[PDB]
Amino acid sequence: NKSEKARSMAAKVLNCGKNKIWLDPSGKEQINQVSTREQIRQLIDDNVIIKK
Amino acid sequence: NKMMEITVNLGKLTKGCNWTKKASIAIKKFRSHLKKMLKTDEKITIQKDLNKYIFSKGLTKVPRRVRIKVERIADKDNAELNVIKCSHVLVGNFKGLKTEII
Amino acid sequence: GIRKVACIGAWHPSRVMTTVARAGGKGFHRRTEINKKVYMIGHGNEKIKTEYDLTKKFITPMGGFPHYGQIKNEFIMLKGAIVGPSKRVVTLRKSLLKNQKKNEDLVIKFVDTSSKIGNGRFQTTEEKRAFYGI
Amino acid sequence: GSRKTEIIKTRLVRARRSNRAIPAWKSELPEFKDKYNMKRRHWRAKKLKIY
RNA sequence: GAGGCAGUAACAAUAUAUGUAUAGAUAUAGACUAGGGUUUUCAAUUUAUUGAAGUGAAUCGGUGUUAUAUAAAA
RNA sequence: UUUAACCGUACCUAUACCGCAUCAGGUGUCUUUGUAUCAUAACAAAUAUUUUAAAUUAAAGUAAGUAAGGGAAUUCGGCAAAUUAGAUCUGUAACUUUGGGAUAAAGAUUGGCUCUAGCAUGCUAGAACUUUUACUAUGUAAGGAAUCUGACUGUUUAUU
RNA sequence: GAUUCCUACUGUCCCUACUUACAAUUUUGUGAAACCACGAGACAAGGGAACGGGCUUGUUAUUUAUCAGCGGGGAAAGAA
RNA sequence: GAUACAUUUAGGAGAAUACUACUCUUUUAAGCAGAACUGUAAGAAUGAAGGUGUAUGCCGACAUUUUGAGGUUACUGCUU
Ligand SMILES: [Mg+2]
Ligand SMILES: [Mg+2]
Ligand SMILES: [Mg+2]
Ligand SMILES: [Mg+2]
Ligand SMILES: [Mg+2]
Ligand SMILES: [Mg+2]
Ligand SMILES: [Mg+2]
Ligand SMILES: [Mg+2]
Ligand SMILES: [Mg+2]
Ligand SMILES: [Mg+2]
Ligand SMILES: [Mg+2]
Ligand SMILES: [Mg+2]
Ligand SMILES: [Mg+2]
Ligand SMILES: [Mg+2]
Ligand SMILES: [Mg+2]
Ligand SMILES: [Mg+2]
Ligand SMILES: [Mg+2]
Ligand SMILES: [Mg+2]
Ligand SMILES: [Mg+2]
Ligand SMILES: [Mg+2]
Ligand SMILES: [Mg+2]
Ligand SMILES: [Mg+2]
Ligand SMILES: [Mg+2]
Ligand SMILES: [Mg+2]
Numbered sequence: 037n038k039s040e041k042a043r044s045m046a047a048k049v050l051n052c053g054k055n056k057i058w059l060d061p062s063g064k065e066q067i068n069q070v071s072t073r074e075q076i077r078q079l080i081d082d083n084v085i086i087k088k
Numbered sequence: 089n090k091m092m093e094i095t096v097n098l099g100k101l102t103k104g105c106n107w108t109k110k111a112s113i114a115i116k117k118f119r120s121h122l123k124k125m126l127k128t129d130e131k132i133t134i135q136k137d138l139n140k141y142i143f144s145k146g147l148t149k150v151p152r153r154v155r156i157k158v159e160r161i162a163d164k165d166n167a168e169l170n171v172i173k174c175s176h177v178l179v180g181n182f183k184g185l186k187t188e189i190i
Numbered sequence: 191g192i193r194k195v196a197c198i199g200a201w202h203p204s205r206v207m208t209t210v211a212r213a214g215g216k217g218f219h220r221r222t223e224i225n226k227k228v229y230m231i232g233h234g235n236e237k238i239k240t241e242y243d244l245t246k247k248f249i250t251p252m253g254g255f256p257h258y259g260q261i262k263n264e265f266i267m268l269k270g271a272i273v274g275p276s277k278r279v280v281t282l283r284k285s286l287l288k289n290q291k292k293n294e295d296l297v298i299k300f301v302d303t304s305s306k307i308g309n310g311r312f313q314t315t316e317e318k319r320a321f322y323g324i
Numbered sequence: 325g326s327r328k329t330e331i332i333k334t335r336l337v338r339a340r341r342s343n344r345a346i347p348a349w350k351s352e353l354p355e356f357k358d359k360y361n362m363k364r365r366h367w368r369a370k371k372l373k374i375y
Numbered sequence: 376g377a378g379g380c381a382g383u384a385a386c387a388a389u390a391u392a393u394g395u396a397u398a399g400a401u402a403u404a405g406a407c408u409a410g411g412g413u414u415u416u417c418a419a420u421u422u423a424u425u426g427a428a429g430u431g432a433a434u435c436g437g438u439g440u441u442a443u444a445u446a447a448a449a
Numbered sequence: 450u451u452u453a454a455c456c457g458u459a460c461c462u463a464u465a466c467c468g469c470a471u472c473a474g475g476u477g478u479c480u481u482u483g484u485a486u487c488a489u490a491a492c493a494a495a496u497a498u499u500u501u502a503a504a505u506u507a508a509a510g511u512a513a514g515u516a517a518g519g520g521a522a523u524u525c526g527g528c529a530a531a532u533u534a535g536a537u538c539u540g541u542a543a544c545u546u547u548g549g550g551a552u553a554a555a556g557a558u559u560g561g562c563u564c565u566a567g568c569a570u571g572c573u574a575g576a577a578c579u580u581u582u583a584c585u586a587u588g589u590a591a592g593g594a595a596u597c598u599g600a601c602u603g604u605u606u607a608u609u
Numbered sequence: 610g611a612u613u614c615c616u617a618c619u620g621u622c623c624c625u626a627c628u629u630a631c632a633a634u635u636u637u638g639u640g641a642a643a644c645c646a647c648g649a650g651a652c653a654a655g656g657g658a659a660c661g662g663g664c665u666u667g668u669u670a671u672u673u674a675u676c677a678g679c680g681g682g683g684a685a686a687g688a689a
Numbered sequence: 690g691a692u693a694c695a696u697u698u699a700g701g702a703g704a705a706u707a708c709u710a711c712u713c714u715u716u717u718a719a720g721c722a723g724a725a726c727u728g729u730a731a732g733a734a735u736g737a738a739g740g741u742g743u744a745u746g747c748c749g750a751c752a753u754u755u756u757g758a759g760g761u762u763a764c765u766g767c768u769u
Contacts, residue, residue: 039395041417053496059395067395071417095719103763104505108630111399112390113504124701125717131392139391140398147389147399152761164392173392186769187719191509197681202660204682205652213508213678218705253724254765257704275704278712307764308725315723322757325410327436327448330456336412345425367414368465374412 042067046076046085056088089160091190095182096121097153098142111147115139122158122172131171138176155179157190224285227269229296234261242299247314252305335374 039059047054059067063084070076079085101117102110119132138156145151155177163169179185195211232238232249239246250260257276272280304310312318328336343365350356 037395042395055496061394061396064395097719100762106504106630109389112501115390116503121718127700127717133392134390136391136393136397143390143399161392171392184720193509194679198679199681201681203652206679206681210681215507218711251724256764259765277704305724310725318724325408325412326458326460327408328457329437333457340413348425367412368471372412375410 038068038070042070042076042085045070045073046080049073049076049080050087052087058086058088060084060086092158093177093188093190094156094158095153095185095187096156098150099152102150107148109147110150111143111145114142114150122174126172128172130169133171133173135173135175138174141176153182155182155185221273223273224287226272228266229269229298230267231265233264238301240298240300245314247301247303249301249303251303252310252312252315253307256306332374339372339374 042059043054043057046057060083063082066079066084070079076085096118098114098118101121102114105113115134122132123129138154141154142150157175157177159173160170161173163171198210199206230238234249237246237248249265254260255276274280303313305312312321342363345361345364346356346359
């Protein structure tokens, strides 16, 4: 359950707040293996991590 | 196995409680009300769209009446035990509606 | 605080006397009062007619008594206030005193039957529908 | 406070090094089987007085 | 070193049958200096313990001049 | 152009400072969106945090409201609370160190909609129609007549 | 700044009544201090260091071992 | 103290309640009706001191009719 690492890193990439990020519970498996900035930018394009 | 439909007004149940917590009290009084009717003492569970409708005005105010449907389902812990689930039913005008058995 | 008594006792005697006022429970006591006059004796199902009215009516007001309902039995009607709330046992007995003073007769003109819930303006149900005209 | 002189940084580096527990390779020896450090400090409790 | 008073005074206590979400609730927020000194980041075990990694300057501060015989990080 | 040396560059602005503490106290400078016909006050954005006992029923407390008739009779003393208040137009006394007193005191007007009339073109006068009548959610002077003392603006026993 | 009188105004008063929130009354968790010669039930009079809880003659309480209030007394506690 | 009887519970309601205790008990709650409180709902049509200009067309505070209407049950009684 590495949810807190995803919320904080994705806030830096888009220059946005933490409360606007919406994770997707369907793609639960892919988020537990993130470690780089590069893997996040593919997750935004697949609309697993979207902005409110 | 038969289903029910009841109309329950929360303005009668929550008359004269402290208004700082009127929505949150209206859930606990709602649970003890159906234990009065149904004699069975297993449990009473609430669907999420029913819970969201009660908190629609805020903590201080509670809407007047609501229309519900009640059924008995199986438990998520033991297969042979049971539990009771409640769900919301949309209706505009409450005049003339009686409790029916599906 | 304000709603209290200031001094309880003096120095000597160095105890608190039983005559002072002290806070405690109230109500549900037993009382007994005398000299209540009897005005009317009858039955609830019957209609009571006087001389000074033209209409005849029952004893139960419109919408019933509050928290009671209707009267379907024999009853008594007496003057004044009576101990206790509604729907509780009340014991009636004869008087101990003798040499009661003679008075004159009792002439009852009419008995009221309006609704006791709100401000009621009508006596019977026929006066209500003749007013609005259905 | 991100503006230090030369002496303040050299003293602060040495004070970080001395706050450590006993290493694990020494604790297996018979001399230091149950012995533990007593001169540790906490950064919120006690202050270092360096200025 | 250990009693009575005493588990007494005094403080803390949001909703959901399936949830990395749907709602409720309180508080304006962000940068330089003085002070603090590894609290930073990550991994493993449960505002803790141990172990690694992390601070890059010709043009951003000091090092220069003086305040009528030791003075400026505005 | 193997020319431009030496030192600091992580992080916290208050649950990462000082008050023996995860203390309702204290601490230099700057920046910060929208409605708001003088402003103020207030609300919303932005951003950051947060999980599960009971209740139409005590007494006496700490706060906030309302009151028939009388109106300071309570009390050392009108202590506490209440009344007045914005803006436009009339009107303004005794006294005087001739500057003031004075915003003295005392009256009248105030919404919404449809137009007319000026020129400076967004400000000001007037008219007709209509209603359970208009600064009042927030903010906003009680007034008058005398006596003792200090000329005035200013300062003082950090903690009676 | 200190003092007296008129007008308006009002629960200051005659004489108090009603409603709401937070603490209190009921439950779970963390969990102290002042004070303590002995206190094992309480009074009337007496003498006594001339105002007794205990001494001397008299009159008297008692719910299976409680709970919530109150400020008469312990010449109540603080400070040679 | 006398005369009868016993080794006598669980869940709800209030005329009873700080927690205990008390008075009663097998029917819970919707919808109608009786009886009341507020004072005329939304929508629709017809008007309106006027104003624009041609489209018998747009913009108008408010008024009348549908309407003693609409809404609610800290009082009694019916029905499934
Ligand atoms: Mg109440
Ligand atoms: Mg420094
Ligand atoms: Mg508390
Ligand atoms: Mg660490
Ligand atoms: Mg840096
Ligand atoms: Mg930095
Ligand atoms: Mg600061
Ligand atoms: Mg500190
Ligand atoms: Mg603080
Ligand atoms: Mg209460
Ligand atoms: Mg009055
Ligand atoms: Mg009056
Ligand atoms: Mg007087
Ligand atoms: Mg007097
Ligand atoms: Mg005053
Ligand atoms: Mg006008
Ligand atoms: Mg002076
Ligand atoms: Mg002083
Ligand atoms: Mg409370
Ligand atoms: Mg004695
Ligand atoms: Mg004597
Ligand atoms: Mg006690
Ligand atoms: Mg001495
Ligand atoms: Mg009793």
